[PDB]
C-alpha cells in the first residue's frame, strides 16, 4: 500500500554510505510507487525530500542518476525551486556520461523561467544540434513543455534556426516536423516554398508523411492549388510503399465525384477496400461513416453491394459490427434484404461484440433516414424495434420520437397508431413523459378525434395520478383549439370524467376550479401561453456633427471597395454614399495587425473629375480587429460638364503606436508613418436610382430636346455589342428597355433605351441604338435631365 | 401569520427532497391575509424574498425530477376592491428591505457552498349436450340393423378436470331398433392437459364393425367456462398491469352498439366488466371497460379493453379498441382473446 | 503527438497499477476510476480488435494476466498506434525473457516504469520499436 510516512522517516537511510544501489533504489521506488499510483502532499515535505535526496550525490552511481530524474520528473508544472541542481546539469554538460544529461534538461522545461532561460543558451543551441541522434532527441522534447509556457525564446532564432532540422534519421525526421506543426501554425507561406522541400525529397518515416498529410489535406479543402501534379505525386506516394497507413489516410478524403473524380482512384481504392475488407485495417469502419463519405451516384451504388455483404455476413469484429451499420447505411438498402437482416439482428443485437451500442448509433441513423417517414418502414421497424427489443429500444425512442417530430410526420394516424398501441404494452412511464409533452402541443391540427380521444382515455387509464394527469395537460392546447366536433362536448367532457383521490381529487377539482375561476375562453388563452437604403445611411452618418453638408442619401455605392487589399494589418473595406448634396465615404474596418493601433488617423483624398472638397475625417483611434469610422466628405457639383465621378487619392496617416495586447499602455508618444491609401473612384450608380419613365415617349424625346450628346464609333475588327455590353448594363446600373433589352446567345440588332435618375435630383437618360449592318456602327445617346450626366454617361459607361 | 412563520421554520428545518408548487397554491386561497394587511411595494418585496428562496433552489440543477413547472398561474398568483387587488397583482408581475433580503438569500448557491465545504341401418347420431357441469353424451345409436348386431369396443380414460365415466354395458345393435346411449362424463376431474380438449377418442370396430370412429374432439371452448368475478379498482389497476400481460386481441368490427353488443358478449362468456364511471357509454362514450372473470378450475382473467362506441357521426360501428387479455398461459390467453373474438360477432360458424 | 491521455496498465480488477496521464485535462482519481469503470467494466478483460470510445481511439489490449489501456484519439491511425502497443508487450517479454503477469507486476514495477518513460514521454511518442531500446538499456 501507499503512505508517505515510512519514507520521510526512512530518509535517514540517506545517512548511510553502505547502501546497495538496489537497496536504496527500492526505497526510492517506494515513494515513487505511492505516487505512480497517486499521492498528494505538502511542498515543505517535498522540499525536504529534495534536500534529503539531493544530499546524496557524490556518485555517478548510474542508477542513482536515473531515479532522481524520475523523481524530479514527477514535479514539472507544479514544481519547487530550480536552482539546486544547476551544477549537476552543468556537470553533465562538461561530463560525457552522455546518457544522463539528456533526461535532466527535459524535466526542467515545464518548470522553467526566463532568466534562467538565459542560462543554457549558447550551448543549448549547440545541444539541440548536437551529435548522435539520441542525444538530440532528448533535447527536443524538453522544449515543448516549455512551449506550453512559451518557446518563443526559441523562436526567434529561426531563419537561421530551422536549417539544422535537416535530418538523417527517419525517426528523427518524423519528429522534426511536428515541432513544425506549430512552425506551420506560425506559417503558411513558408510551407509553400517549403513544401517544395518536403515535396522536393521523398520521405523516410511513414510518420513524417502523416503529419504532412493532414496538413496537405488541410490545404486541399478549398484547393491546395493545382494539386494536379502534386496531388498526383502524392497520390503515388500515399498509394504504395511498405507502410499501409498512408494509402488509407489518403483514401478516405479523396473521393471527389458527384460527377467528379473517380478515375484511377476508384480502382486503387477498390484494391484497398477489398484488401482491408477483412480487418486488415479494422480502420475501414470509421471511414464509411464519413471520412470516406458515401451517398453515391446511381450505377455506382449497385456495385457496392458485395463488400457490404461481407461485413453484413460476417457479423463479427467490433470493427466489423460498426462497419456493417455504416456501409449498409451509406450505400443504402432494398426493403427485402432488410427482412433477412431483421432476423439476423434479432439474435445479433444484444451482445455480439456488444452490438447494441453500434446499433443505437445505427438506429440513430435509421431514425434520421426515416424519422417517421417511409412510415411503412417506420412501422415495420417499429414493430420490430419493440419486438427485438431487450429493452434497449427506449434510448433509441428518445431519438426516434424526436425524428418523427423533425419531419413533423404526417402518416401520424398510423404512426401514432403503432406508437399508441405498442407503447401500451411496451411500457415505460418515462417515454410517456416526453411524448406527452409533445403531444400536448399538437392536438387538433391533426384531427382524428374519436381515435385520439380513444387513446387519450387509455393513457389516463393507467394508474398514476401522474399518468392520468398528462392527458389533461396535453389537452389544454387541444381543448382550446377544439377539433372536428370538440367545443360543445369539450365543455361536456371534463364533467363526464371526474376524480377523487384527494390530491388526485384535487387535480380534477382544481383544474375545474381553475376552470371555474376563468371564462373558459379567456382561461384557455392565458394558460396556454432619393432617400434610399442609403438614406438610412445618410442618417447613420448623421450622429457625427463635424459636417460640412450632407443632404439625404440618393443611392449608395454599387460596390464597397476594400481600400486595403487582402488581410492587411490596416484592412480596409470602404463604402461610398451619395446624397443629393454631398457624398460621404465612410470607411469600415479592422486596423489589422495586433502590432498596431492607429492613432491620429485622418483620410486624404485628392480628386480628378469634380467635387468640392470640404474635409478628410479620420477616426480618433483604431485598435485591432475592430471597425471604427473615418470618413472623408465632399459636396457634389451637379450641372457642370464633369463634376461627381472622380477618383480620389488616398494616403493613410497615423501615428502608429505598438501594442501589448496582454495589458497594453496608451501614452501620448508614438511616431507617424503614413502608408498609401487606395483609390476611391466614384461611380454612376452610387447616385442613381434606375427606373422606368414617367413618360417615356415624351420623356424619351424630350430628354433629347434639352439634352443630348452623342458619340459614334464604327466597329471594324469585331461585330459584337458584347464588349460594349459588358461596360454599359453593368457601369450605369440601369435598366435596358423599350422591351429593348433581350438578346439570346445571339440576336440580329439591339437598342437599349435605358433608365435611372441621377443625384441632385436630375436624371440621366441613355439611348443606345447599337446598329448592325454587319459592322456595328452605333449611336449612343445620352440625354439627361442633368448636364453633368450626358458627358458622363458617354464616359462612365466605359 | 402564525401559520406562515411555522411554515418558514419547518421549511428551514427540512431540506432533503420533495415537490409542491401545488402546495403553494394550496395555502394561498382565492384571497387570504398576508403581511400586516398590506405593505404594498414592501409587500411586493415580501412576496419576492419568501417565494424567491423557493425559487432559488428551484433555479438550481436536479437529480430525479420532483415536478416540471406549470406555474403559469404561478405568475399571476404571485402578483371593486377585488378588481383593484387583481390590478395590483398584475402590475407586480419596507419593500426595499424585503428585496435586499431576497437578494441575500439568492437555494442552489447555498447547496453549492455546502458541496465545496464537503470537498348403415344402424345409424348412430350423436351430439353432445352439456347439461349443467356435466357434459353428457347424447348418443343415438340406432341400430336399424337387422339384429342386435355385435358391437365393438369402447375404452375409459382420465380426462381433463373431468373424466369420462359411463358406458351403457351391452353390445348388441338390436334390430331396426333405436338406442340411447348415455355417457356421463365426470366434470370436475381427470386431468389431461390436451388443451381445448381435442383429444382423440375411441369408438371401436371391435365387433359387428370392422372400423368405427376414432375421433378427436374439437368443439370444446372457453367462452362459457369462466364466470364473472370482481375487484377494488386502485388495486385492480395496479394489478392489471401486474398480471400476465402476455395476450391481447382487438376489437374492431360488428353489427350492433356495444350496449346490446356488450351485453350479448358478456352473457355469452358469462363474465364480468367490473365497474362504470359515468362518462357515459352513450354520447360516445370514450370508455375503457374493465373486465374480470373467474372459472371452474379457477383461473382469474383480466381485461382492459378500450373502445370507440356507436353514435351517428360521432364514434363507433367498429372499434379499433384493443382487447387486452391476460391469462396465465399465453396460449390459452390469446386463444381466449380469439375465443372472444369468435364470440364478438354473430355470423355462420 | 502529445497525444497520450493516459496509458494505463490496468489490472482487470479495474485496478490500475500504472497510469500516466501523459497528457490530461480531466482529473480525479475517482473520475479516473469512474471513467475507467464504465469502459473497463464493459470491456471486462475482453477488448476489441479495435475500439473507439469517445471518437477517440481506445487501444487497449489484454495479456494473459493484465489489461492494457492506451487512450488516444481516433485522429491517429491504428497501425502505428498499435505498433507501440505491440512494442510494449513484446520488448518486455523478450528483454525480461518474460512478458507481463500479475506476478511479474507484483514483484517489481520499476522496469515498466523505466521502459515507459523511454518509449513515450507524454503526448508524443518518442519511439515504438524495441531494439534501440534494448541496446540502449542495460539495467
UniProtKB/Swiss-Prot annotation, chain A:
Ranges that cross the membrane: none
Region (Interaction with ZNF289/ARFGAP2): 533-798
GO cellular component, one term: Golgi membrane
Recorded topology in the membrane: Peripheral membrane protein
InterPro entries: ARM-like (IPR011989), ARM-type_fold (IPR016024), Clathrin/coatomer_adapt-like_N (IPR002553), Clathrin_app_Ig-like_sf (IPR013041), Coatomer/calthrin_app_sub_C (IPR009028), Coatomer_g_Cpla (IPR032154), Coatomer_gsu (IPR017106), Coatomer_gsu_app_Ig-like_dom (IPR013040)
BP-aspect Gene Ontology terms: establishment of Golgi localization; intracellular protein transport; organelle transport along microtubule; vesicle-mediated transport
Listed Pfam families: Adaptin_N, Coatomer_g_Cpla, COP-gamma_platf
Stretches forming HEAT repeats: 44-81, 263-300, 302-335, 336-372
Alphabetical list of SUPFAM superfamilies matching this protein: ARM repeat, Clathrin adaptor appendage domain, Subdomain of clathrin and coatomer appendage domain
Chief subcellular location: cytoplasm
GO function term, MF aspect, one: structural molecule activity
Localization, UniProt: Cytoplasm, Cytosol; Golgi apparatus membrane; Cytoplasmic vesicle, COPI-coated vesicle membrane
Keyword line: Cytoplasm, Cytoplasmic vesicle, ER-Golgi transport, Golgi apparatus, Membrane, Phosphoprotein, Protein transport, Repeat, Transport
Family under the similarity heading: Belongs to the COPG family.
Function: The coatomer is a cytosolic protein complex that binds to dilysine motifs and reversibly associates with Golgi non-clathrin-coated vesicles, which further mediate biosynthetic protein transport from the ER, via the Golgi up to the trans Golgi network. Coatomer complex is required for budding from Golgi membranes, and is essential for the retrograde Golgi-to-ER transport of dilysine-tagged proteins.
PANTHER family per the UniProt record, alphabetical: COATOMER SUBUNIT GAMMA (PTHR10261), COATOMER SUBUNIT GAMMA-1 (PTHR10261:SF3)
Name the UniProt record assigns to this protein: Coatomer subunit gamma-1
Species per Swiss-Prot/TrEMBL record: Mus musculus
Gene name as annotated: Copg1
Curated annotation (Swiss-Prot), chain B:
Post-translational modification: Proteolytically cleaved between Ser-59 and Ser-60 by CAPN8.
Location(s) in or outside the cell: Cytoplasm; Golgi apparatus membrane; Cytoplasmic vesicle, COPI-coated vesicle membrane; Cell membrane
Modification sites for N6-acetyllysine: 25
Expression tissues: Predominantly expressed in the upper one-third of the oxyntic mucosa and in most regions of the pyloric mucosa. Ubiquitously expressed including platelet, liver, heart, spleen, lung and kidney.
Misc remark: Brefeldin A induces dissociation from the Golgi of the beta-COP and presumably the other coatomer subunits.
Protein task: The coatomer is a cytosolic protein complex that binds to dilysine motifs and reversibly associates with Golgi non-clathrin-coated vesicles, which further mediate biosynthetic protein transport from the ER, via the Golgi up to the trans Golgi network. Coatomer complex is required for budding from Golgi membranes, and is essential for the retrograde Golgi-to-ER transport of dilysine-tagged proteins.
Assembly and oligomerization: Oligomeric complex that consists of at least the alpha, beta, beta', gamma, delta, epsilon and zeta subunits. Interacts with CAPN8. Interacts with SCYL1 and PRKCE. Interacts with COPG1. Interacts with ARF1 (myristoylated); this interaction is required for binding of COPB1 to Golgi membranes. Interacts (via trunk domain) with ARF1 (via switch I region); the interaction is direct. Interacts with KCNK2 (via N-terminus); this interaction increases the channel-mediated whole cell currents and promotes plasma membrane expression of KCNK2. Interacts with STX17. Interacts with TMEM115.
Annotated protein name in UniProt: Coatomer subunit beta
Organismal lineage: Eukaryota, Metazoa, Chordata, Craniata, Vertebrata
GN (gene name): Copb1
Full-protein interval shown: 470 to 953 of 953
Curated annotation (Swiss-Prot), chain C:
Keywords: Acetylation, Cytoplasm, Cytoplasmic vesicle, ER-Golgi transport, Golgi apparatus, Membrane, Protein transport, Transport
Protein's membrane topology: Peripheral membrane protein
GO cellular component, one term: Golgi membrane
UniProt key word Acetylation: yes
Keyword Membrane: yes
GO annotation (BP), single: intracellular protein transport
Subcellular location: Cytoplasm; Golgi apparatus membrane; Cytoplasmic vesicle, COPI-coated vesicle membrane
Function recorded in the entry: The coatomer is a cytosolic protein complex that binds to dilysine motifs and reversibly associates with Golgi non-clathrin-coated vesicles, which further mediate biosynthetic protein transport from the ER, via the Golgi up to the trans Golgi network. Coatomer complex is required for budding from Golgi membranes, and is essential for the retrograde Golgi-to-ER transport of dilysine-tagged proteins. The zeta subunit may be involved in regulating the coat assembly and, hence, the rate of biosynthetic protein transport due to its association-dissociation properties with the coatomer complex.
Subunit relationships: Oligomeric complex that consists of at least the alpha, beta, beta', gamma, delta, epsilon and zeta subunits.
Stated family: Belongs to the adaptor complexes small subunit family.
Protein name: Coatomer subunit zeta-1
Organism of origin: Mus musculus
Lineage summary: Eukaryota, Metazoa, Chordata, Craniata, Vertebrata
Residues of the full protein shown: 10 to 148 of 177
